[PDB]
């Protein structure tokens, strides 16, 4: 696909066929749940959590070790962010690009990529509004984008 480019490259993860996994892991479920809540207490996104349990310890996926996925147990433990991580990284990239544009006016490909980034932002905002993980009337504007990064 790659709507905002022309690349057709396929590069991703190949999840193993073993749904119950991996018969060499000795820690318990509650051990890794307390690991995720301790690691998310200090302010990390769930992608960083997944890679950091993937490489420091033996965790293939948190979905197959526990019974459920990651921000399911984060929202059950009360550590769900007010906006999820993908939209947050998109809007922080947007305000960084807008800071570049207000610094340098003539970076005109930066204008083009800013329109691309806000297109992705509006698509994710529409999807998050129709599933109501965001309230309706929530809208992205630049003045609230400067402070919405938090």
């Amino acid at each position: 696909g790659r709507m905002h480019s022309a690349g057709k490259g396929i590069s991703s993860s190949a999840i193993p066929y073993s749904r119950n996994a991996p018969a060499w892991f000795k820690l318990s479920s509650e051990s890794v749940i307390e690991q995720i809540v301790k690691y998310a207490r200090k302010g990390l996104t769930p992608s960083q959590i997944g890679v950091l349990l993937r490489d420091a310890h033996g965790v293939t996926q948190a979905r197959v070790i526990t019974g459920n996925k990651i921000m399911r147990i984060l929202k059950s433990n009360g550590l769900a962010p007010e906006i999820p991580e993908d939209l947050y990284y998109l809007i922080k990239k947007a305000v960084s690009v807008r800071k570049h544009l207000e610094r340098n006016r003539k970076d005109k490909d930066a204008k083009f990529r800013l329109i691309l980034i806000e297109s992705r932002i509006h698509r994710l905002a529409r999807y998050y509004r129709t599933v109501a993980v965001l309230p309706p009337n929530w809208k992205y504007e630049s003045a609230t984008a400067s402070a919405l990064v938090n």
């Binding site: 396929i10 991703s12 993860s13 190949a14 193993p16 066929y17 991996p22 060499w24 033996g58």
Partner: peptide
């Protein structure tokens, strides 16, 4: 790794 019969990872621990 995605072009086999069933896809699986070629990495290891």
């Amino acid at each position: 790794k995605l072009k086999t019969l069933v896809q699986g990872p070629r990495s290891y621990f």
